[PDB]
Amino acid sequence: HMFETVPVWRRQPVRVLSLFEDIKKELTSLGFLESGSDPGQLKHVVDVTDTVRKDVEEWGPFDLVYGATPPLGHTCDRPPSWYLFQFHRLLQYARPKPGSPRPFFWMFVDNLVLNKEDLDVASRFLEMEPVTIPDVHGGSLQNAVRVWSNIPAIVSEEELSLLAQNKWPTKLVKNCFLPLREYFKYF
Amino acid sequence: HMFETVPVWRRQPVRVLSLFEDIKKELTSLGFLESGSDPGQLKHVVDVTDTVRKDVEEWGPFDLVYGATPPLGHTCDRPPSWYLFQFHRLLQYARPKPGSPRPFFWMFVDNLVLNKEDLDVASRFLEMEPVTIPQNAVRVWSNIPAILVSEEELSLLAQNKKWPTKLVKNCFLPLREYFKYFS
Amino acid sequence: MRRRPIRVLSLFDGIATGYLVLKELGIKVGKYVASEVCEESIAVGTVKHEGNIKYVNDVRNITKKNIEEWGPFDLVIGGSPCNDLSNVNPARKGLYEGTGRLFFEFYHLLNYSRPKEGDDRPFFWMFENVVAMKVGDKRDISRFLECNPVMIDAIKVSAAHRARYFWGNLPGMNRPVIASKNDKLELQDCLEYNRIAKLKKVQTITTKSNSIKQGKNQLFPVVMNGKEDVLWCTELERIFGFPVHYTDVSNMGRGARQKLLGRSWSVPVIRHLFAPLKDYFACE
Amino acid sequence: MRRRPIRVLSLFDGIATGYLVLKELGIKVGKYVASEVCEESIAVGTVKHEGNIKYVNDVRNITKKNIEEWGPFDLVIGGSPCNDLSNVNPARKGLYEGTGRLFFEFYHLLNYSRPKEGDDRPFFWMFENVVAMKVGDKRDISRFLECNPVMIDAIKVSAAHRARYFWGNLPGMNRPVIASKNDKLELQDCLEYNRIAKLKKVQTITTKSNSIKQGKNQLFPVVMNGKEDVLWCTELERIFGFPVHYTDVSNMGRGARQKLLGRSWSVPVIRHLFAPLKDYFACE
DNA sequence: GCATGCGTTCTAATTAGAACGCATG
DNA sequence: GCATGCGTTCTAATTAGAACGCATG
């Protein structure tokens, strides 16, 4: 959904739930998170197989849910789709009830770890095509992610598909977080 | 199919119906027919495909029905089974009715022109195994009371090859105890 | 003057059409002796008639005493194989060789079963074969049965062509053939739900699948969901007039069932021929 | 206040057991939307229910709007393919690969169909799969459905072994299973005439023919005319509780029909599970 | 004129039948 | 408990489908 901007004085510190990957030290850099709170507003968890709704409900409320694949490599024990389906599972636990519509956002990013069949189920489950964020500069290093998100932030797959053969990039995810300054406190 | 002997004075000239092969000149040698009258007691016919019961019945009563295959060294005009089924067809027309039991006989002879399973059709249709009378041989199915070689011998005998009337006629004699004897 | 159930000898019985037609007419069937060699035909008759049929195997092993012991018979029916009598086969062997000579077995047993003269008891018989035979064979068959055949084409009472010859002495064999209220006369009447018939009548069905698509074009006879299709086993059963699933037996598939159905009699034609028998035998 | 007919979404519908069970219970069926991929399963559901089922093809192409427009739904049922979840197959690509991941499509559409919280409307759902799966798969499935499964073996109500897991929220799923008067509990009770059952219960029937001959011995289960035989398609239909000839469709033979039946639900088990729905919907 | 059909015979498809398998229960 | 089973793969056949055919009319 579209959410109206907050007046600056009513903005609050985000409560976020980040699965598989931790964006804690990242998100502090943009001031969404504050280094004073020992009980951080970020909850991180990696083995989510035995997480129940009642776990998510008392670890929250949350305003942002973030999930990500392991980086390209890592010797992944789990099938790459597993990170998708589990992220989709909890995200439903964390959504606000219909009768309490608050600003609420979610992001999922993949490290080129998902095949084409997995990406087509990724976009059926998250109800949108991904957007391809590339890394390349004056030395022309090669690195990429694709993101699914309801955040208003938002190339050839020849290049991507042969890139993958030869081998976490926060650099590319971080810029999509800053349209959330219009909803939560800044620094 | 078994008949008491008849006294000699009441014996009468046999009436015979011979199909495919003719035994007329044959049978007179044994005195069953009298060489004399052209309208004999023997009726001969070869192409029986369009003969009806009414034909056989108006050809007058018969005491003997005889049928035989063509000889071996001969043109197979029709399938060898054809002579069997046709012989069986008219024999049934010629039989006396149940309420008129009169000595009545039939004979069918083959020239070794019938293969094995044709012979099993022959003996189920004529309700008896044949007797093999023998270098050359024929086998007869007959109800007349007259009636030692491997069929290996007979079956390789057959291949390398004239109706052998010589051989059939001796089985005809026991009919003298039912019909007149001409000398 | 009372009537008793009918006692039947049925040679080359196939899938027991004779029994089925009699039971559909309400005639009490006291004995039905069937000579048949194909195991799956026998399975059909066995299962579909719950053991009322006495099977006796190869017609050529029935003896004169067998006919005495199993009889008397009121009705002797048969339809012998036409592999060698039809023009449809290039290698015809004719009436006297191959399987064409099985007709004489019918001729043979017919005579054993006939009542003796003086016995004025009812006795009916019927023999069927295809029309696509030569005049010599048709002549000789009716030389041996002593009568001429009626030709009846099932196209008058069914959705398919099939013209056959019937010899016999049943009452009224030469009468005209009229359709009944429940005869399925058009191919559409015999198809399952959601299937379209392209024709109203189909060419004669044989045991082989090429007889199902029609004419020179060899066109599939049915449209389903926009695509062409051949007929289904249930649709074949309906064309021939058998009960639906009559041949759904013994794990048989499309081929097996078409073989049995393709050589069978058209039920409504046999009903027409057998119907005058109701007034000579016991009824349900 | 009155009850209305039930509106059903059926994923992986197979041969429409869901619809058949409902119609057999006297429940008025207002809409039955089935997603199914195999053409001959679809033919069975189509012909045997005369077009009452709305087919919508691949579950993975049903959209959130589809669920809005085709719905509302009162009952969402499904049984996903077990090629990759059963330990019967050495090659199992698990819950997350191959076809095992089709389960999540059920989880996905289930959530689309669920009423919103303001809606305290009746809503029932049920998901079935095999017992022969990994404990991790069984754990994750009921992590996603948020509930644990009942195990029901058809042997209590059928002539065959078949143990399955059922998740859902139907009334009384955990209650004891009792056989009803017309359940055919012994194999003899499902064979055709003149066939003898060697056992009273038969091992689990799968899509392949080796499931029909029993145990280590691999023995044919039936004796007919003194020789052993395998089961017939009508007898398979009877074991599973389907109407005889339910799969006698589309020219399918022994193999095709065993495939459809081997992956099907046991009708009397589904009847038991669906029976409490009579008091929530219209009845004939 | 020349269209049809109670089929046998080729080959190319489907199909049928056993081994193969180990966690789950 | 030490056997069981909403199956895939191999091969051995089963079977399917199309030319082939000419007298009966």
Ligand SMILES: Nc1ncnc2c1ncn2[C@@H]1O[C@H](CSCC[C@H](N)C(=O)O)[C@@H](O)[C@H]1O
């Ligand atoms: N020697 C024999 N003895 C008995 N039946 C035989 C036979 N040889 C062939 N048959 C059978 O004769 C039948 C001829 S087809 C006749 C089918 C039958 N008119 C029906 O209505 O179904 C075939 O079933 C064939 O199996």
Ligand SMILES: Nc1ncnc2c1ncn2[C@@H]1O[C@H](CSCC[C@H](N)C(=O)O)[C@@H](O)[C@H]1O
């Ligand atoms: N992607 C898909 N979309 C819809 N159905 C599918 C599918 N993939 C497989 N299927 C079907 O799902 C079914 C699973 S077996 C389920 C059978 C069913 N429960 C019954 O009672 O008969 C199979 O029929 C299979 O063909």
